[PDB]
Amino acid sequence: APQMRLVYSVRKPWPISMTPSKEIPLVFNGTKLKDTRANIVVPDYWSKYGSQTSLEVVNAILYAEDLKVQRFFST
Amino acid sequence: DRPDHIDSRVWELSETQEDWITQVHGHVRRVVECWKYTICCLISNMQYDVFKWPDLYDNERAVAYKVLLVSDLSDHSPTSGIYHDLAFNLEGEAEESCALVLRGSQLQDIKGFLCRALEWVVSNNLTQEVVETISGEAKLQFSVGTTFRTLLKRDTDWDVIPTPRVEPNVPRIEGRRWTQMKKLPLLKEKEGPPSPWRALLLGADSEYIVCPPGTDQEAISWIHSQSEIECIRESKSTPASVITCLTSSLQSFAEGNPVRSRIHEDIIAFGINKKQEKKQSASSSASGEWKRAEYQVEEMSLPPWVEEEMVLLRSDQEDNWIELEKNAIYTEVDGVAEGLVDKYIEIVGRTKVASVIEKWQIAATRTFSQLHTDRSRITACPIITRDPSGNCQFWGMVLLGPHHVKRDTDNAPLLIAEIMGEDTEEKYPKHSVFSLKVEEKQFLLSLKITSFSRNKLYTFSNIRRVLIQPASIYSQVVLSRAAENNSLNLEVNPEIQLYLEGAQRGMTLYQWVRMILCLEFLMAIYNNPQMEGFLANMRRLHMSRHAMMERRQVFLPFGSRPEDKVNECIINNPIVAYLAKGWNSMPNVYY
Amino acid sequence: MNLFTPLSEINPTTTQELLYAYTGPAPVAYGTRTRAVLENIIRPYQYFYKEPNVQRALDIKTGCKEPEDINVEGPSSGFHTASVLKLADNFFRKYRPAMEKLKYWILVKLPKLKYAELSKGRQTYSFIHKRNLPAPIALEETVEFLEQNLRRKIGPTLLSYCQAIADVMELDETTYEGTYTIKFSREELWDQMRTLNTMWKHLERGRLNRRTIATPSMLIRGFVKIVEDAAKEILENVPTSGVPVGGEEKLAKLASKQTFHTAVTGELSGDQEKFNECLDPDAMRLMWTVFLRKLGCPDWIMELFNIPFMVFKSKLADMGEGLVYTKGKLTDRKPLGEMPSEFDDLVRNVVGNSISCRLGMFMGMYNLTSTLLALISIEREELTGSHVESSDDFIHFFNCKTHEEMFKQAETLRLTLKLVGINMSPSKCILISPAGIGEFNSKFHHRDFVGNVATELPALVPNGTNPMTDLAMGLNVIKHSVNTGQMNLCTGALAMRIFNHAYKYAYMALGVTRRTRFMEENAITPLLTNQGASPVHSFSTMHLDEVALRRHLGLLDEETLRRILNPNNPVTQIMEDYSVPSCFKYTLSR
RNA sequence: UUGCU
RNA sequence: AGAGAAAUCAAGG
């Protein structure tokens, strides 16, 4: 069962598997990020030091999900 | 006659269009034709032309169409290039190509009409007949050969298609009278030695040592370097020599090594090679004849410590011990839900059982995290919690021995050390008690040799779920008062009437919820086939009691003894016995 | 127990969910299942006669008995052949529109059923590799076995698969030909179909003793699906079945209309003892034949439905790895026929590692069809009450004029079930003379209050795929419990607190972890729930995605939202998931 | 390596 | 030893 292993899996040295890339540094502030397989930190790093997309693309992804939000807050 | 769903105007329109009578099953075919024309009317309800009686021509797209009804949409093929077709199921659905030509208006109109048309065919029992008209015959799609037929008839007295020649009739059988449950049954109380405490951890007797704030290693190093351990009570089950196993793990963990090498005392503590030793001993002393295995479960009586465990588990504490992040609030319904949970946490948070649940939560989680691989060495799992001020609280340590489990239900050897307040020999016969000195403060340390499976550790790794059941009871009390008073009051604290020591006395709701959680916690940590069987068969007796309170009568079949289904589950479980005695204390007859 | 019996502001019915120890670990079965399997097999032969005579009962092919043979005072395996014809006939006139949808299902859905749905079944014992495999692999090798021996391609329709099964048994000899090139004769292939793979029923609650379940061979699993799907069509349209719907509205309507004036009402709640130890396959094989014959179905439909039950009459139940024998302190496991035991009557029926038996059933083979055999027995002129039943669990509402009339109907209900081989458990059936209290399928009823109590608590831990999927899946599970009534306003809110706090811990968002230490060191503020931020969901917002809802409330600013939603980021690239693709939808390494 | 009240 | 409950674990190589 995947639920009996998530706690152990997340706490492994390299829990996540990511496609090889160069925009993610090997080490950022003394923490080794890569080596593919990376550590659990990498998603947090991307949320602040990652590359930004266009605002139009953001609305495209959050369109069907955004509609159900205003539907709840309009009634 | 004409069906109700078929309009009268359509009925006479097609009356002379085709020789309905001079056909096979003309009546059904006529109604099918009227369906197709009605579909065209719904399509051209507001462009589309009509040739019915190509049969409809769109003017917006200049395309001719011909509506045909097909049993299966997935069996659609281009009928002809002269005229495009829209195929509709008898239930009302349309082909993916149909939705492109039409739109929401026409598609919704055609369906529903075909639904009531499908209701008409069901009502008149013509389901086969319409299909034989919508499409061709289905011929034979399955046959059984001679050889397979002979094999199928070896173990039955009938053919492949059973044709018994008896006349269908329901015989009359003489039954037995139903008897009335005039009194509630009494549950058998087993006799024998008092049941010892047989849970993974200590429960109400659990205590902790306050340590300076820091990490787990710092807390262990603080305790190990300046503590004195000496045995005051030794058990045969847990020899006093296994204290070296704990101190070795305390020293290793204090140095940053949760995993240490084997020592001599590890063989006794973790039962290394015990499988081979007992197998060799059994074979050497084996004599006689092979006999069918007969396993026996020793019956034990209700132990005195169960009642005192309930009292201690309900005792007040200083910290809240239940710190769950508050959810968001957006609506009035959301605010009431969060208020009920917030008040519930206040009622049961500052209790001993809440702190013990946290100890069980942490101990199970840490032990389970070290059972995901195969390890021939010994791992130390500290049970350390932290108060709001940050001081580390050392409940104890769990040592995990060599484990090579293949299935999740196999037992892994454990040596559990816990800090305890009061020692009771008959409550802890298999525990070895050691006196611990920590900065002029006396502490009692227990050691037990236990084996405990991976699956059971996972369930106790989220033992915090035990709070659900008492919360449901508390919520329904408050909501019931809100409904009758037409106003919600989160601070309502009504008095609950209960049978206490055989007498009916009222008791506070807040106190009733506290030791519902205490009882639920004990049932959770002592859950086993005896517990599961006892509670499952106890619900109908509990339901029977509630019927008797409101003057309802309870009746039973001929050989009905509902207490037997419960008595067989009372063997040695302490809380099951404790629950059984509570039932016997309650009145068995209601007037 | 006196603590669970309130006398003021609350009734004992409300506290029925306190009589559940589902918080603790579920029982697990250990070791061999041979004793449990043989005990299941020997019961219908013991119950076939009023006095126990296993030896004579072993020669019975069809378990049809005279009315005087039925055991009133105890379990009575076997059926009455005249009653089944009449009772099924009575079940046909009543609910005739309900069975008209069955004819539509036969004429439309049945030819269109695909055999690929057999891949979603439970663990299947391979007749090729002689070991357990999951269903999709077992189906793949079975289909290739059919294609090579029959020298033709098998159509996607389930009927084509069943036709291949009938055709392959006409062959004198059959081979697999991979390397393995293993070889079966007609009798060896026949034995594979008859074989039932028995196994322990693990993680089962509410029982002191462990039972066993049996699975059918993949060769016959195609036939089993047809009859079960046809049974599901009838049960969804007949008001006496509680299996369909899923929301358990059947008891809700009976609760509402329970109010009667100047009438002796009554509510009988109970279960069936030895439900799978007393039913005869020929009983419900005759019932299906009556249904199809009076409905006008063709002959090939009749033969298709009867085959799965005819194979079950010849079933070869696998005993397992033997009975445990002890000399001293050592244990040895031996087959049934090696040494004397309590099952010596069945030695003559031992065929290799399996055993042949013509009577009795197993729990996990025919659940829906067994329900129909119970519902047809209710259709009598004397039984004027309302009945709801799901396998070995039923509730019946009596509405009579006198108390004696109810008791006559109550006994008639008990005896009519014995005509089809179903025995009420005397110690598990409770009749409350003033109707208004009863239980059925973990639904406790008191007047207008119908309490839905979950048999198993929803898992309040993350699933283990990724933080976005886990949050959506976990909240949806809580939403289901609230919708069905298993949770209420306060319990549902507490469920998130337990789930959210456990969801944060599994992703190292609590306390001081390596993931947490990085954020407070690099000034990365927690903006998502898995990052340690405050939970943004509420009781009324269970169905809303975190990312979309945080944007509306301003929790997620524009800068961070653009980074996490990048489709070209390297991190990533109910049953389904409303989770937007983001940098937190990663995959854990294997 | 080790921090759920 | 112990865990446990109708028979297993206390590795298997």
Author numbering:
A (entry chain C): 52 to 86, 97 to 136
B (entry chain A): 3 to 48, 56 to 62, 85 to 622
C (entry chain B): 1 to 178, 209 to 603, 620 to 636
Show sentences the authors wrote.
Thogotoviruses, exemplified by Thogoto virus (THOV), are capable of infecting humans using ticks as vectors. Numbered by size, segments 1, 2 and 3 encode the PB2, PB1 and PA subunits respectively to constitute the THOV polymerase. Although the 3 polymerase subunits show low sequence identities to their influenza counterparts (∼15%, ∼27% and ∼19% to IAV PB2, PB1 and PA, respectively), THOVPol exhibits similarity in overall architecture to influenza virus polymerases (FluPols). Here, we report a series of THOV polymerase cryo-EM structures with resolutions from 2.3 to 3.2 Å to reveal the initiation and elongation processes of THOV RNA synthesis.
Three featured conformations relating to transcription initiation were observed by cryo-EM using a sample containing THOVPol, 5′ vRNA, 3′ vRNA, m7GpppA and GMPCPP, a nonhydrolyzable GTP analog. The first identified structure, designated “pre-initiation conformation 1”, shows a polymerase heterotrimer formed by PB2, PB1 and PA (referred to as a polymerase complex monomer, or simply a polymerase). In pre-initiation conformation 1, the majority of the PA putative endonuclease domain is visible. The 3′ vRNA binds within the secondary 3′ end binding site groove formed by the C-terminal domain of PA and the PB1 subunit; this site has been proposed to bind 3′ vRNA prior to its entry into the polymerase active site cavity. Due to that the 3′ vRNA is yet to enter the polymerase active site cavity, we ascribe this structure as a pre-initiation conformation.
